[PDB]
């Protein structure tokens, strides 16, 4: 099967392309997620119940 060679090479070129990516430590990613969540924590009605005056479904 010539087709088999094609898929086998494509799985090799794709894997080579999907291997040379700069990676960062997971601690930095967790810190960034923490910072964003703490930054935008005061603007979501689900987390903090808003007064019934501004609620359109009341």
């Amino acid at each position: 099967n010539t087709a088999s060679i094609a898929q086998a090479r494509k799985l090799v070129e794709q894997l080579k392309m999907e291997a040379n990516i700069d990676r960062i430590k997971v601690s930095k990613a967790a810190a960034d997620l923490m910072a964003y969540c703490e930054a935008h924590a005061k603007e979501d009605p689900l987390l903090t119940p808003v007064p019934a005056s501004e609620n359109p479904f009341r």
Binding site: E18, A19, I21, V26, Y36, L47, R58
Partner: protein, 329 residues
Amino acid sequence: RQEAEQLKNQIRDARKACADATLSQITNNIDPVGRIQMRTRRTLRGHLAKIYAMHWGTDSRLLVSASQDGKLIIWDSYTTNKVHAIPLRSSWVMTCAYAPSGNYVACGGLDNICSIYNLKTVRVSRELAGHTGYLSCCRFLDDNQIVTSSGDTTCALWDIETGQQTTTFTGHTGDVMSLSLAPDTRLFVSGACDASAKLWDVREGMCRQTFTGHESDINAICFFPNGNAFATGSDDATCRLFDLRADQELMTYSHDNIICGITSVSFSKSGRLLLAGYDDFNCNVWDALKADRAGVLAGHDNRVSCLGVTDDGMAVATGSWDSFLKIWN
């Protein structure tokens, strides 16, 4: 062609080399948000058959839903009264979408055709064909181009004006079931039935990364508001949180008392709460940064198949096989 294992081993070693610490270690002194109680505010009726999908409007006021009766109904959440009702040619529909500009509505299903509608004229505008399998999801990237995912292990980026495929994404092995667009509409992800997810490029049209943390079929996928993470839900009663920059998963959401599958996943505006619908006739509200339950949304008498949160984050709406749409808060 025996070098494929070597590259996989190298990728695994590179991923292991950057695992400095677990997310739970960093987020351990945070005071939990505590129990959260939500009550039904509205109940929408009128669907003869059992529902699959829904999509909120961009104004957080209107929403659309599709059912197996062969009918799309555009509701008004504030005054719980209908606006439009569109009969369809084929009664087997599996998806729906709402335009960012509020002018078009798309819906496709078991027939290998994606149809769009012109609300402000209600007649069919164009029919997009070319797929060889059932459609599973579709989203408007803009007012003139749409991205769809079908059951023949492919995705496409259509052009509405000409009705011809522009770019075709290939590389998956199993059926593609769901996708979600980034806030900048420059990248999107997709969850297949081969227990894998991928991060495509809209412009170039080449896959960049592959995550294979799951072990069964993937039914739902969402995307973090920050644009640097996403969450998936599979049939093994687990929700996993991946990260693009680190390139491996960071946290798993599972409980020993639930063994049913997951049908929908969504986030909140702040991203602190993760909402996931189950086959247990109800829904759960996890904690994104702590992996601990925080509430249950009961009230449905059958399977839950839809879920969504408004853009302004004022309410969360669900749709089940009981042919009823409910609005929680």
